[PDB]
Design a protein around this motif. Structure first.
Motif, PDB file in Angstrom:
ATOM      1  N   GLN A 113       5.531  -3.205 -13.004  1.00 58.19           N
ATOM      2  CA  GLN A 113       4.379  -3.157 -12.114  1.00 58.19           C
ATOM      3  C   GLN A 113       3.952  -4.557 -11.682  1.00 58.19           C
ATOM      4  O   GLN A 113       3.674  -4.804 -10.511  1.00 58.19           O
ATOM      5  CB  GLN A 113       3.238  -2.429 -12.827  1.00 58.19           C
ATOM      6  N   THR A 114       3.907  -5.469 -12.646  1.00 53.31           N
ATOM      7  CA  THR A 114       3.528  -6.850 -12.392  1.00 53.31           C
ATOM      8  C   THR A 114       4.565  -7.540 -11.508  1.00 53.31           C
ATOM      9  O   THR A 114       4.211  -8.220 -10.552  1.00 53.31           O
ATOM     10  CB  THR A 114       3.359  -7.633 -13.709  1.00 53.31           C
ATOM     11  N   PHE A 115       5.842  -7.362 -11.841  1.00 50.05           N
ATOM     12  CA  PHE A 115       6.943  -7.895 -11.039  1.00 50.05           C
ATOM     13  C   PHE A 115       6.834  -7.471  -9.577  1.00 50.05           C
ATOM     14  O   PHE A 115       7.079  -8.268  -8.666  1.00 50.05           O
ATOM     15  CB  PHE A 115       8.288  -7.439 -11.613  1.00 50.05           C
ATOM     16  N   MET A 116       6.458  -6.215  -9.360  1.00 54.63           N
ATOM     17  CA  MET A 116       6.315  -5.680  -8.011  1.00 54.63           C
ATOM     18  C   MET A 116       5.128  -6.295  -7.271  1.00 54.63           C
ATOM     19  O   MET A 116       5.257  -6.744  -6.133  1.00 54.63           O
ATOM     20  CB  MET A 116       6.160  -4.158  -8.050  1.00 54.63           C
ATOM     21  N   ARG A 117       3.968  -6.286  -7.918  1.00 49.63           N
ATOM     22  CA  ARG A 117       2.728  -6.741  -7.302  1.00 49.63           C
ATOM     23  C   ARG A 117       2.676  -8.257  -7.123  1.00 49.63           C
ATOM     24  O   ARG A 117       2.023  -8.760  -6.208  1.00 49.63           O
ATOM     25  CB  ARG A 117       1.540  -6.247  -8.131  1.00 49.63           C
ATOM     26  N   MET A 118       3.368  -8.982  -7.995  1.00 49.61           N
ATOM     27  CA  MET A 118       3.384 -10.438  -7.923  1.00 49.61           C
ATOM     28  C   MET A 118       4.554 -10.938  -7.086  1.00 49.61           C
ATOM     29  O   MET A 118       4.647 -12.130  -6.793  1.00 49.61           O
ATOM     30  CB  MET A 118       3.456 -11.047  -9.324  1.00 49.61           C
ATOM     31  N   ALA A 119       5.436 -10.019  -6.704  1.00 52.75           N
ATOM     32  CA  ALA A 119       6.649 -10.345  -5.952  1.00 52.75           C
ATOM     33  C   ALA A 119       7.468 -11.425  -6.661  1.00 52.75           C
ATOM     34  O   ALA A 119       7.690 -12.509  -6.117  1.00 52.75           O
ATOM     35  CB  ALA A 119       6.300 -10.781  -4.541  1.00 52.75           C
ATOM     36  N   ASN A 133      -5.391   3.063 -11.202  1.00 54.00           N
ATOM     37  CA  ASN A 133      -4.642   1.896 -10.758  1.00 54.00           C
ATOM     38  C   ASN A 133      -3.221   1.872 -11.314  1.00 54.00           C
ATOM     39  O   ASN A 133      -2.411   1.016 -10.943  1.00 54.00           O
ATOM     40  CB  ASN A 133      -5.384   0.618 -11.165  1.00 54.00           C
ATOM     41  N   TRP A 134      -2.920   2.801 -12.215  1.00 51.67           N
ATOM     42  CA  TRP A 134      -1.612   2.812 -12.852  1.00 51.67           C
ATOM     43  C   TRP A 134      -0.551   3.491 -11.988  1.00 51.67           C
ATOM     44  O   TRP A 134      -0.669   4.666 -11.648  1.00 51.67           O
ATOM     45  CB  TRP A 134      -1.681   3.492 -14.216  1.00 51.67           C
ATOM     46  N   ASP A 135       0.498   2.744 -11.662  1.00 48.36           N
ATOM     47  CA  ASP A 135       1.607   3.265 -10.878  1.00 48.36           C
ATOM     48  C   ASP A 135       2.843   3.415 -11.753  1.00 48.36           C
ATOM     49  O   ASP A 135       3.061   2.618 -12.665  1.00 48.36           O
ATOM     50  CB  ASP A 135       1.920   2.339  -9.702  1.00 48.36           C
TER      51      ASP A 135
END
Ligand SMILES: *[C@@H]1O[C@H](CO)[C@@H](O[C@@H]2O[C@H](CO)[C@@H](O)[C@H](O)[C@H]2NC(C)=O)[C@H](O)[C@H]1NC(C)=O
Ligand SMILES: *[C@@H]1O[C@H](CO)[C@@H](O[C@@H]2O[C@H](CO)[C@@H](O)[C@H](O)[C@H]2NC(C)=O)[C@H](O)[C@H]1NC(C)=O
Ligand SMILES: *[C@@H]1O[C@H](CO)[C@@H](O)[C@H](O)[C@H]1NC(C)=O
Ligand SMILES: *[C@@H]1O[C@H](CO)[C@@H](O)[C@H](O)[C@H]1NC(C)=O
Length: 161
Positions: A113-119, A133-135
């Motif tokens: 999730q973090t990897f995705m949102r932080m690119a 907020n959990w995906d």
């Protein structure tokens, strides 16, 4: 030197990020199709190993502000110890929507999730889970590997054992 030199973490094909917990020590998070731990075990046989294990996962949850929902779900996980430095490997089941949904309430998913949102690297797909907020994150990566290592060595895989 024991056995042959380890492959690189930082590769054209890998998505990676380093969490610096200590002054120069920390966790190297690597999303890969490369397996590092080759057994099906996570033997926390003594209090020290259990303590090193909890500290590693606590660090990830703290740094990424992971509020993991209680879905009673788990990721396939191996762990090993190399002189006080832990390696944790997740065999991710996030390759399909149904698989991701059943391994959604997990630390590994929080990392994805973090990897995705932080690119930070790699492309992912976010599925709306049941809560806020959990995906639930889909990835083609088979492995999420976490290793206690230094900043000077974070770009190369450490020895699991
Ligand atoms: C994650 O998947 C890898 C790959 O299948 C597993 O590594 C295998 O482990 C068995 C031992 O049970 C070996 O016989 C195989 O040769 C290994 N394969 C490879 C490619 O290394 C690993 O055990 C799995 N981890 C978990 C926690 O399920
Ligand atoms: C993790 O623990 C398991 C069980 O505690 C280990 O499997 C044992 O290995 C011995 C070999 O000496 C065999 O008797 C059996 O395969 C297992 N014994 C029992 C009592 O379960 C496994 O080798 C350990 N692996 C790691 C990496 O620590
Ligand atoms: C990892 O393996 C999967 C399945 O074999 C594949 O679809 C994916 O493209 C691979 N990713 C990388 C970065 O090699
Ligand atoms: C790495 O291991 C050392 C000792 O083995 C420990 O003090 C340190 O907290 C560990 N780092 C992380 C990020 O868990």
């Amino acid at each position: 030197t024991l056995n042959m030199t380890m492959p690189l973490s930082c590769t054209k094909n890998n998505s990676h990020h380093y969490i610096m917990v200590g002054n120069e020590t920390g966790l190297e998070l690597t999303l890969t199709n490369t397996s590092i731990i080759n057994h099906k075990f996570c033997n926390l046989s003594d209090a020290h190993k259990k303590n090193l294990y909890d500290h590693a996962l606590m660090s990830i949850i703290s740094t990424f502000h992971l509020s993991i929902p209680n879905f009673n779900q788990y990721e396939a996980m191996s762990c090993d110890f190399n002189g006080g430095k832990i390696s944790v490997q997740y065999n991710l089941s996030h390759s399909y929507a149904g698989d991701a949904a059943n391994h959604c309430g997990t630390v590994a998913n929080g990392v994805l999730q973090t990897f995705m949102r932080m690119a930070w690297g790699g492309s992912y797909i976010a599925l709306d889970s049941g809560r806020g907020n959990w995906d639930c994150i889909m990835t083609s990566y088979q492995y999420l590997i976490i290793q206690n290592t230094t900043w000077e060595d974070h770009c190369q895989f450490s020895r699991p054992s």
